[PDB]
JSON list of C-alpha atoms in Angstrom, two decimals:
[
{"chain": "A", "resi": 1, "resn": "UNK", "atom": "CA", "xyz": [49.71, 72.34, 106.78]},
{"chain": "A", "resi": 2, "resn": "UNK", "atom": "CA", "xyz": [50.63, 73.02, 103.23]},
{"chain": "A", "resi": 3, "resn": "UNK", "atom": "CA", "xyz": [51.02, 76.43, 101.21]},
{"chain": "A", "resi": 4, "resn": "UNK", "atom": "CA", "xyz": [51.68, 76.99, 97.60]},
{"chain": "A", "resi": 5, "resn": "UNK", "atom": "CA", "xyz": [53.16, 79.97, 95.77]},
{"chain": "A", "resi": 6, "resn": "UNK", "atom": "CA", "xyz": [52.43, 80.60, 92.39]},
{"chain": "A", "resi": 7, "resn": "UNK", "atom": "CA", "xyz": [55.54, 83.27, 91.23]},
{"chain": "A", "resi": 8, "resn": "UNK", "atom": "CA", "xyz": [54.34, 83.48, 87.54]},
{"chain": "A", "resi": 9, "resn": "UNK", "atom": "CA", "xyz": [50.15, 83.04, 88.02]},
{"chain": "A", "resi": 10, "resn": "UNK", "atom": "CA", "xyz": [52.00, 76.40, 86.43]},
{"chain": "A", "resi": 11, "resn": "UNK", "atom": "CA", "xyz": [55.30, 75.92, 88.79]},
{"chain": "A", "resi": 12, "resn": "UNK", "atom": "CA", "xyz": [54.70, 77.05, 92.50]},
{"chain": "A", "resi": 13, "resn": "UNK", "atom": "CA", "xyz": [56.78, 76.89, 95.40]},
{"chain": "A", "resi": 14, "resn": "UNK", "atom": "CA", "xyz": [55.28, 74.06, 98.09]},
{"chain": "A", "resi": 15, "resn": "UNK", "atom": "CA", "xyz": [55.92, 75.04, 101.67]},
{"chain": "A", "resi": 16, "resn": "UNK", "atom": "CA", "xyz": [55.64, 72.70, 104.19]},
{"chain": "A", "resi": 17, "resn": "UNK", "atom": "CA", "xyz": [57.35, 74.20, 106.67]},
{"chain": "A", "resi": 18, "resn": "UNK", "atom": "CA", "xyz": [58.43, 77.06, 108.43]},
{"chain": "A", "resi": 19, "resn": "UNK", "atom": "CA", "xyz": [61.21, 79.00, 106.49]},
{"chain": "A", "resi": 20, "resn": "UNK", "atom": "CA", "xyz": [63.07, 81.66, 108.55]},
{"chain": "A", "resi": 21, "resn": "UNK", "atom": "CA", "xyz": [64.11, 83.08, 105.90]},
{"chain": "A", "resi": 22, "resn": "UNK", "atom": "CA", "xyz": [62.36, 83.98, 102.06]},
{"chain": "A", "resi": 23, "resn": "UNK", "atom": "CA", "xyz": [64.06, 86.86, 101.05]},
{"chain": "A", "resi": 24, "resn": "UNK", "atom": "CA", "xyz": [66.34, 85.28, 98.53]},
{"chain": "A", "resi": 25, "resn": "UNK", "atom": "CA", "xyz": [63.23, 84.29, 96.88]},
{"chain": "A", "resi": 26, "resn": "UNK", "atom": "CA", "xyz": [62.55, 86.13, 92.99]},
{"chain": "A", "resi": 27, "resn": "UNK", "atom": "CA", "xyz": [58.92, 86.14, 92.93]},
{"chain": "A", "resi": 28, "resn": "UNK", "atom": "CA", "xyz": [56.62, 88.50, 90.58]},
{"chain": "A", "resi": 29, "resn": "UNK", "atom": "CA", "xyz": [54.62, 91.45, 90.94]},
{"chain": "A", "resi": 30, "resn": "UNK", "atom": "CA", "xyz": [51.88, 89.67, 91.13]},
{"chain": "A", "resi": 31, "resn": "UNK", "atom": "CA", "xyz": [51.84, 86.11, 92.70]},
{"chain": "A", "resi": 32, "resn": "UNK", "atom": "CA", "xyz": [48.78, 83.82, 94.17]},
{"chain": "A", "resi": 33, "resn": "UNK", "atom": "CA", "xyz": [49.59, 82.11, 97.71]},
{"chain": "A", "resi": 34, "resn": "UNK", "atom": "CA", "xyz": [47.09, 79.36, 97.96]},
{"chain": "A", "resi": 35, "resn": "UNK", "atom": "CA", "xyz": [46.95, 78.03, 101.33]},
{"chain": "A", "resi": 36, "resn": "UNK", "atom": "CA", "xyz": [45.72, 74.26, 100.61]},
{"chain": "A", "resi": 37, "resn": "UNK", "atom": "CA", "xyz": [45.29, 73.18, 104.48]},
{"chain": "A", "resi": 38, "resn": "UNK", "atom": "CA", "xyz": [46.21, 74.74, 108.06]},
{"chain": "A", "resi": 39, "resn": "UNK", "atom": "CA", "xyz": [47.35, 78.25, 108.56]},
{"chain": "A", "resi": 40, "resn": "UNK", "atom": "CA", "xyz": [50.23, 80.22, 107.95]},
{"chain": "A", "resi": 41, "resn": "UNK", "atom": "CA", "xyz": [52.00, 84.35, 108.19]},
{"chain": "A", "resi": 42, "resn": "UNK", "atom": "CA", "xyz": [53.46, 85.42, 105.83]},
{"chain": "A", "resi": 43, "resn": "UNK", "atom": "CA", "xyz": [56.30, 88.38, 107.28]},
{"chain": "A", "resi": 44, "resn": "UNK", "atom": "CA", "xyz": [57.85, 91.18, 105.82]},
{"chain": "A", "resi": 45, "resn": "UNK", "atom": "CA", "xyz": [61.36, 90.39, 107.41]},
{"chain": "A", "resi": 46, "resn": "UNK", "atom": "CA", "xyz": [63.31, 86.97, 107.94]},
{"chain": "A", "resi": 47, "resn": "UNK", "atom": "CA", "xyz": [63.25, 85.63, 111.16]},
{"chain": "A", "resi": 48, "resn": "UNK", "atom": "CA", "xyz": [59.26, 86.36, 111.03]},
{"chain": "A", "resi": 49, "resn": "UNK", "atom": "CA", "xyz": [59.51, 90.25, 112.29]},
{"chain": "A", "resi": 50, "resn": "UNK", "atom": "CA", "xyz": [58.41, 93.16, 110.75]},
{"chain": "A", "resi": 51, "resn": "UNK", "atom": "CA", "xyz": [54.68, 93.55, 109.20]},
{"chain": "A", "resi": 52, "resn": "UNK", "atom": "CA", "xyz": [52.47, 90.36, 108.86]},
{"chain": "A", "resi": 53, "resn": "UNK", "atom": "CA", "xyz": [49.74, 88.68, 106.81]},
{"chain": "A", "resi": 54, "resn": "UNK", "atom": "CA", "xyz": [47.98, 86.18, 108.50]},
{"chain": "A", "resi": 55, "resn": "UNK", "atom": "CA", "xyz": [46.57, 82.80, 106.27]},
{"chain": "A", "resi": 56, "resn": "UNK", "atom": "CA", "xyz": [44.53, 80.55, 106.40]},
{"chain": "A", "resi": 57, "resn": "UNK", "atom": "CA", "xyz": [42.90, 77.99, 104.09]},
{"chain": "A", "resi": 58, "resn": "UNK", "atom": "CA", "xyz": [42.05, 80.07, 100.67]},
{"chain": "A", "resi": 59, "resn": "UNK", "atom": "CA", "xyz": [43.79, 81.48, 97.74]},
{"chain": "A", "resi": 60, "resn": "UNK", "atom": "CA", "xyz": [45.38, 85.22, 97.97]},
{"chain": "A", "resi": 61, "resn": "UNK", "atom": "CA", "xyz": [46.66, 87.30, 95.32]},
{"chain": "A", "resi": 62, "resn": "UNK", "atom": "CA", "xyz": [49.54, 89.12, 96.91]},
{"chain": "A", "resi": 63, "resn": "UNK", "atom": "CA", "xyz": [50.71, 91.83, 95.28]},
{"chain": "A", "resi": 64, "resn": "UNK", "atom": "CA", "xyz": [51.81, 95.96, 96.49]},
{"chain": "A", "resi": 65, "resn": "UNK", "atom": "CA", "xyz": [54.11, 96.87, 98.60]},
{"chain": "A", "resi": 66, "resn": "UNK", "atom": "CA", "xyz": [54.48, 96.40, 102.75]},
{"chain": "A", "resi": 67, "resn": "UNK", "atom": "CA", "xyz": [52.87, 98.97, 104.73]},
{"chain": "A", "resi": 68, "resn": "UNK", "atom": "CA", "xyz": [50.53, 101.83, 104.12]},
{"chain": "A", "resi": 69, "resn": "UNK", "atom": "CA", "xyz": [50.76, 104.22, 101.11]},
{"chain": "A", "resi": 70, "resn": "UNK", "atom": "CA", "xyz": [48.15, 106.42, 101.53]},
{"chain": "A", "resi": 71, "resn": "UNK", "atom": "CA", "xyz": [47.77, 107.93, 97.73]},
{"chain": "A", "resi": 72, "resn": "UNK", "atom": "CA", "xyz": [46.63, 104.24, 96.66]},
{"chain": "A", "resi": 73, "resn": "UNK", "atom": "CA", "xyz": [44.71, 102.67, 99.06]},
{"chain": "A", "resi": 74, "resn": "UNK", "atom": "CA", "xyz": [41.35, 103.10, 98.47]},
{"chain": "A", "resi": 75, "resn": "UNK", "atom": "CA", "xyz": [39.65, 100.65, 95.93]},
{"chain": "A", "resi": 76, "resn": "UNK", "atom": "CA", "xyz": [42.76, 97.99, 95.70]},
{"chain": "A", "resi": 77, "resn": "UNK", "atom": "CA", "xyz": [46.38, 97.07, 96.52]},
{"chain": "A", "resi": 78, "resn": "UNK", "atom": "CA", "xyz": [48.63, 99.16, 95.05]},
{"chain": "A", "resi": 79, "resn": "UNK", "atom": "CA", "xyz": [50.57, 97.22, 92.06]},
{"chain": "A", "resi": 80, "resn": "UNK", "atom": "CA", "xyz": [54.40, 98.03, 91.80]},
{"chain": "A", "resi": 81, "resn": "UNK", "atom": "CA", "xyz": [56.77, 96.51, 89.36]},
{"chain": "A", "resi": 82, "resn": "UNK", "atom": "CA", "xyz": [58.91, 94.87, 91.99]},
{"chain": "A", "resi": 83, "resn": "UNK", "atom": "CA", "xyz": [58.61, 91.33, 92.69]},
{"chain": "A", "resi": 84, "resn": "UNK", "atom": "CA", "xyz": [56.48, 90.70, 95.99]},
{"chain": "A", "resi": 85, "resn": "UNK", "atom": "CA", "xyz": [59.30, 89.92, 98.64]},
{"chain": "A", "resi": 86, "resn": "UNK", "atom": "CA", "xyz": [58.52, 87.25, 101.55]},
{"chain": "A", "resi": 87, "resn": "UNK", "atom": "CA", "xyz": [60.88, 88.01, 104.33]},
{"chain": "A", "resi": 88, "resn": "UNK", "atom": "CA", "xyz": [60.27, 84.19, 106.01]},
{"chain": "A", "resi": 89, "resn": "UNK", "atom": "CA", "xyz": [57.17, 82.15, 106.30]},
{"chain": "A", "resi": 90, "resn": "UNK", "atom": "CA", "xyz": [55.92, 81.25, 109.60]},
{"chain": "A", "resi": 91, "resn": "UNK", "atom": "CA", "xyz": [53.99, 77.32, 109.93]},
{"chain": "A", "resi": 92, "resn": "UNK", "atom": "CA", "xyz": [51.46, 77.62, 112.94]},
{"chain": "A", "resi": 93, "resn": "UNK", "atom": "CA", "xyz": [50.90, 74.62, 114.38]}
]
Protein backbone atom coordinates (compact mmCIF):
# COMPACT_ATOMS: atom_id res chain seq x y z
CA UNK A 1 0.00 0.00 0.00
CA UNK A 2 0.84 3.62 -0.14
CA UNK A 3 -0.07 6.65 2.29
CA UNK A 4 0.59 10.28 1.92
CA UNK A 5 0.83 13.05 4.51
CA UNK A 6 0.19 16.40 3.68
CA UNK A 7 1.97 18.53 6.90
CA UNK A 8 1.10 22.02 5.42
CA UNK A 9 -2.54 21.17 3.42
CA UNK A 10 2.05 20.68 -1.94
CA UNK A 11 5.03 18.50 -0.22
CA UNK A 12 3.72 15.31 1.65
CA UNK A 13 5.43 12.65 3.30
CA UNK A 14 5.04 9.11 1.11
CA UNK A 15 4.91 6.07 3.33
CA UNK A 16 5.43 2.92 2.00
CA UNK A 17 6.14 1.16 4.77
CA UNK A 18 5.77 0.46 8.21
CA UNK A 19 7.63 3.09 10.44
CA UNK A 20 8.03 2.10 14.13
CA UNK A 21 8.60 5.12 14.94
CA UNK A 22 6.96 8.93 13.78
CA UNK A 23 7.37 10.90 16.63
CA UNK A 24 10.30 12.93 15.46
CA UNK A 25 8.03 13.98 12.79
CA UNK A 26 6.97 18.21 12.85
CA UNK A 27 3.68 18.04 11.31
CA UNK A 28 0.81 20.87 11.60
CA UNK A 29 -2.27 21.36 13.38
CA UNK A 30 -4.01 20.44 10.76
CA UNK A 31 -2.69 17.82 8.21
CA UNK A 32 -4.61 15.51 5.43
CA UNK A 33 -3.45 11.68 5.43
CA UNK A 34 -4.58 10.41 2.11
CA UNK A 35 -4.43 6.79 1.97
CA UNK A 36 -3.90 6.20 -1.98
CA UNK A 37 -4.15 2.17 -1.87
CA UNK A 38 -4.27 -0.67 0.96
CA UNK A 39 -4.75 0.05 4.58
CA UNK A 40 -2.92 1.42 7.28
CA UNK A 41 -3.08 2.61 11.63
CA UNK A 42 -2.00 5.28 12.42
CA UNK A 43 -0.80 5.02 16.58
CA UNK A 44 -0.45 7.38 19.17
CA UNK A 45 2.93 5.84 20.48
CA UNK A 46 6.08 4.37 18.56
CA UNK A 47 6.31 0.89 18.40
CA UNK A 48 2.42 1.01 17.29
CA UNK A 49 0.91 1.06 21.10
CA UNK A 50 -1.18 3.38 22.63
CA UNK A 51 -4.59 4.74 20.90
CA UNK A 52 -5.22 3.91 17.15
CA UNK A 53 -6.82 5.16 13.92
CA UNK A 54 -7.50 2.65 11.59
CA UNK A 55 -7.18 3.61 7.41
CA UNK A 56 -8.09 2.65 4.68
CA UNK A 57 -8.30 3.91 1.09
CA UNK A 58 -9.66 7.76 1.43
CA UNK A 59 -8.44 11.09 2.45
CA UNK A 60 -8.59 12.16 6.37
CA UNK A 61 -8.08 15.40 7.85
CA UNK A 62 -6.37 14.65 11.12
CA UNK A 63 -6.32 17.12 13.41
CA UNK A 64 -7.15 17.36 17.76
CA UNK A 65 -5.62 15.79 20.17
CA UNK A 66 -5.43 11.74 21.23
CA UNK A 67 -8.13 10.58 23.35
CA UNK A 68 -11.39 11.92 24.60
CA UNK A 69 -11.94 15.55 25.80
CA UNK A 70 -15.26 15.68 26.69
CA UNK A 71 -15.92 19.74 26.63
CA UNK A 72 -15.31 19.51 22.67
CA UNK A 73 -16.60 16.62 21.27
CA UNK A 74 -19.76 17.11 20.04
CA UNK A 75 -20.07 18.64 16.44
CA UNK A 76 -16.12 18.20 15.42
CA UNK A 77 -12.52 17.35 16.42
CA UNK A 78 -11.24 19.54 18.69
CA UNK A 79 -8.43 21.87 16.93
CA UNK A 80 -5.29 22.61 19.15
CA UNK A 81 -2.31 24.59 18.10
CA UNK A 82 0.10 21.70 18.43
CA UNK A 83 1.25 19.90 15.51
CA UNK A 84 -0.68 16.44 15.10
CA UNK A 85 1.98 13.86 16.47
CA UNK A 86 2.15 10.21 14.77
CA UNK A 87 3.74 7.97 17.29
CA UNK A 88 4.65 5.13 14.31
CA UNK A 89 2.68 4.02 11.35
CA UNK A 90 1.65 0.54 11.08
CA UNK A 91 1.53 -1.15 7.03
CA UNK A 92 -1.13 -4.05 7.16
CA UNK A 93 -0.50 -6.40 4.82
Amino acid sequence: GKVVIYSEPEKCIEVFSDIQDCSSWSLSPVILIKVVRGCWILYEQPNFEGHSIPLEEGELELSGLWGIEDILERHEEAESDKPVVIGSIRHVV
